């Protein structure tokens, strides 16, 4: 049984029982945003947060050192940054994350199903060039997929590629991964969950139920 | 007798490493050797060249 | 096609000459090095307002001009002080407008964007090297860049031919041309050769600056009235017959003369950028410049004259076209605005550009200092050389 929520809070308080913590670091949000992790990784995260605060030449204020400590073990290592030569990569791997965060905020308006954006990085830290972190909502909001939630997820998928297209005035290959995710989500929307209007009530004659991970 | 002992555990995987050895007093030092860029490649050629 | 004020006073002409270069350099600042097809898709509504979100190497702040207009302003102020061209005071004003802050890492990290050859020349003349031995330190790379071009034919800016045949000679020659407007042509040529004695001593750069300055002089002389003086064909014929001596400059100006349709008045820039007129303009611009980059002096002067004369009678359209042409956009738009200001006084500059110039980081005092430099350029007297 891996610790979670209250157990993760207890582990973080135990590993921060001798270190000064700024009030801006939400311990509950940090515990909910790090699911499946154990003490044998949260100890390293608190360790690297402390060392980053020490190397920063100040005390453990602000949430940026905590987020860097989380990132050092969730998205391991730090790659070199995007080059300042030419305006293409700095524009693409900022426009996609800006558009995702903007669409997330706009869908947080009106509907409210989309969770808030924690941070956007665009500094390559392992196997990726840019990120958008979402403030993982409480559980029991993820134990059930709603039609509006799936529509918002499809929109958030398409957001990065269409934001790159809107910034550049040009279609790129950044829409390929977003299209690959959104088509799978739309097939789950139409066939399996039956949220569409196919046939007049949304019940298709065929649906691809997912298989287990044991295969 | 670890006076001067040193182990370089070459790791071709950043995000898969034992949770017990990444504590202080152990394998907690990390070095990302990057691929060289234009300058670096050039210098390598000049070094081999001479 | 004649603007409006058919008679323009010299004060208005010179303040417009300074302010057109100002608004062109501010408007086209974030589009340096970009190509025209990238620019017309980045700004789908047209380059009609100052951009606030430059994200490049040295992000230009809102309302801020670059080192090209800094050099033009320094040239205008030094010429107004000296009542002519004196290279020592010219370099003093150029260095005073260059060492305005930065980080001595010692390349000094200039506050505004500068051409590589311009930065090298200013660093050399600030490093004790005398401002007449151009190849002593100006052939750093350059000749080695030509030796390195032996296995690559890139259009990358790092391989652009920056040197004594650059466009910085012709980008700042418009104040010289407007001052030497009524003092004849030969004295203007001597003044230009005095002005480029420390940076651009090549005949190509000399001819580029000569064409630009002579055009500025001519524009100052004629007034926006009847088509007897208001004729781009007459300007091209005068430049070809009196100023154009070199072969490539001559050929580019005849290639302009043969072509050069007149652009219609444009309202929807999104519809214009997808139109046959913009297609023909880009085809002629690609014939007059290599891959959208007119680094050579002849190509740069031909591109400036194309952007000025293809939209004759609409200087705002000329400045917007030169900004949207990309490549060396801030210098090209600065030269086009300077020529359009030597033609028409301070009445065609829109209130949006006026407010953007005033509300920027180089605003209020900077805008009125540009106006005062124009006033001094109008008020300076030379008596055919002084």
Three-state SS annotation for C90-101: HHHHHHHCCCCC
On whether any CB of chain A is under 8 Å from the CB of B15, the answer is yes
Quick one: resolution in A?
3.2
Contact call for residues C51 and C66 (beta carbons, < 8 A) = no
Interface test with A, best of B11, B12, B15, B30 (most A CBs within 10 A): B15
Contact call for residues C37 and C278 (beta carbons, < 8 A) = no
On whether any CB of chain B is under 8 Å from the CB of A61, the answer is no
Whether C34 sits inside 8 A of A87 (CB atoms) is yes
Which residues are bridge partners to A120 per DSSP?
A132
Whether A79 sits inside 8 A of B20 (CB atoms) is no
CB-closest option in C40, C55, C57 to A91 = C55
Contact call for residues C91 and C168 (beta carbons, < 8 A) = no
Contact call for residues A149 and A193 (beta carbons, < 8 A) = no
Q: Left, alpha or beta for C55 (phi > 0: left; psi -120 to 50: alpha)?
A: alpha
In chain C, which ranges are continuous DSSP H helix?
A: 10-27, 36-42, 67-82, 87-96, 116-126, 134-138, 143-148, 168-171, 174-179, 186-195, 203-221, 232-242, 247-258, 269-273, 276-288, 297-309, 315-324, 329-343, 351-358, 365-379
Structure tokens at C339: 């020529």
Whether A94 sits inside 8 A of C55 (CB atoms) is yes
Measure B8 CA to nearest chain A CA, in Å. 17
In chain B, which ranges are continuous DSSP H helix?
A: 38-49
Helices C10-27 and C351-358: crossing angle in degrees, nearest 10, is 70
DSSP reduced 3-state for A163: helix
Helices C203-221 and C232-242: crossing angle in degrees, nearest 10, is 140
How many Å from the N-terminal Cα to the C-terminal Cα in chain C? 37
The answer to whether chain C touches chain B by having 3 or more C-beta pairs less than 8 angstroms apart is no
* CB interface of A with B, residues 157-176, below 8 Å: none
Distance between CA atoms of residues C221 and C229, nearest Å: 9
- State the DSSP H helix or E strand holding residue A133, giving kind and residue range, or none if neither: strand A132-134
Structure tokens at A68: 């860097």
List Cβ neighbours of C91 (8 Å cut-off, separation of 6 or more).
C125, C131, C198
Distance between CA atoms of residues C75 and C68, nearest Å: 11
Measure A76 CA to nearest chain B CA, in Å. 5
Classify residue B42 as exposed, middle or buried by CB count within 10 Å of its CB (0-12, 13-18, 19+).
Answer: exposed
Inter-chain CB pairs, A–B, below 8 Å? 25
- Which residues of A participate in catalysis according to the annotation? 97
Contact call for residues C26 and C356 (beta carbons, < 8 A) = yes
Q: Any idea what the Cα angle at residue C153 is, between residues C150 and C156, rounded to 5°?
A: 120
Measure A91 CA to nearest chain B CA, in Å. 21
Whether B19 sits inside 8 A of A41 (CB atoms) is yes
């Amino acid at each position: 049984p891996k610790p979670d929520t209250e157990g993760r809070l207890e582990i973080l308080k135990l590993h921060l029982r001798n270190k000064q913590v700024a009030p801006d670091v939400d311990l509950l949000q940090l515990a909910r945003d790090l699911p499946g992790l154990v003490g044998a990784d949260l100890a390293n995260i608190v360790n690297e947060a402390a060392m980053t605060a020490v190397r920063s030449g100040r005390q453990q204020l602000t949430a940026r050192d905590i987020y860097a400590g989380v990132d050092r073990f969730t998205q391991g290592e730090v790659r070199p940054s995007l080059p300042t030569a030419h305006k293409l990569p700095v524009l693409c791997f900022a426009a996609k994350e800006i558009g995702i965060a903007l669409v997330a905020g706009e869908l947080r308006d009106r509907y409210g199903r989309v969770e808030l954006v924690e941070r956007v990085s665009i500094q390559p830290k392992g196997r990726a060039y840019s990120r958008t972190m979402f403030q993982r909502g409480t559980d029991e909001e993820y134990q059930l997929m709603t039609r509006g939630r799936l529509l918002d997820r499809i929109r958030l998928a398409l957001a990065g590629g269409f934001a790159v297209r809107t910034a550049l005035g040009e279609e790129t290959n950044f829409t390929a991964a977003d299209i690959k995710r959104a088509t799978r989500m739309a097939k789950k929307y139409v066939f399996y969950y039956g949220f569409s209007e196919a046939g007049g009530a949304g019940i298709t004659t065929w649906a691809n139920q997912p298989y287990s991970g044991d295969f | 007798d670890n006076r001067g002992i040193v182990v370089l555990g070459a790791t071709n995987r950043p995000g898969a490493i034992d949770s017990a050895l990444i504590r202080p007093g152990r394998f907690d030092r990390i070095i990302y050797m990057p691929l060289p860029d234009a300058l670096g490649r050039a210098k390598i050629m000049q070094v081999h060249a001479r | 096609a004649w603007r409006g004020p058919g008679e323009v006073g010299d004060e208005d002409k010179a303040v417009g000459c300074l302010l057109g270069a100002a608004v062109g350099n501010v408007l086209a600042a974030p589009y340096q090095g970009d190509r025209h097809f990238e620019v017309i898709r980045l700004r789908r509504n047209g380059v009609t307002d100052f951009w606030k979100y430059d994200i490049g190497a040295q992000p230009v702040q809102y309302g801020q001009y670059t080192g090209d207009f800094a050099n033009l302003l320094a040239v205008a102020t030094s010429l107004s002080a000296s009542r002519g061209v004196e290279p020592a005071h010219l370099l003093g004003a150029l260095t005073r407008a260059y060492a305005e802050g930065g980080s001595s890492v010692s390349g000094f990290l200039p506050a505004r964007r500068y051409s590589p050859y311009d930065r090298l020349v200013m660093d050399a003349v600030l490093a004790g090297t005398d401002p007449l031995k151009v190849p002593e330190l100006a052939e750093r790379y350059l000749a080695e860049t030509t030796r390195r071009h032996a296995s690559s034919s890139s259009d990358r800016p790092d391989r652009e031919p920056h040197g004594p045949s650059d466009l910085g000679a012709a980008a700042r020659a418009a104040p010289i041309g407007l001052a030497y407007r009524r003092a004849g042509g030969e004295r203007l040529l001597a003044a230009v050769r005095r002005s480029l004695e420390f940076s651009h001593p090549t005949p190509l750069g000399l001819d580029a600056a000569h064409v630009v300055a002579a055009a500025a002089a001519w524009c100052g002389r004629q007034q926006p009235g009847d088509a007897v003086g208001a004729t781009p064909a007459a300007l091209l014929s005068h430049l070809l017959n009196d100023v154009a001596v070199t072969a490539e400059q001559c050929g580019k100006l005849r290639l302009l003369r043969d072509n050069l349709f007149q652009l219609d008045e444009v309202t929807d820039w999104r519809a214009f950028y997808a139109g046959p007129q913009w297609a023909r303009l880009t085809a002629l611009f690609s014939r007059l410049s290599f891959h959208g980059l007119a680094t050579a002096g002849s190509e740069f002067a031909s591109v400036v004259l194309l952007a000025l004369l293809s939209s004759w009678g609409r200087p705002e359209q000329a400045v917007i076209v030169a900004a949207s042409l990309g490549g060396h956009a801030p210098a090209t738009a600065q030269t086009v605005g300077a020529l359009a200001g030597t033609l028409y006084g301070q009445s065609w500059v829109p209130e949006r550009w006026w407010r953007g110039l005033g509300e920027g980081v180089e605003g209020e005092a900077g805008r009125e200092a540009v106006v005062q430099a124009g006033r001094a350029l109008a008020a300076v007297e030379l008596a055919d050389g002084l």
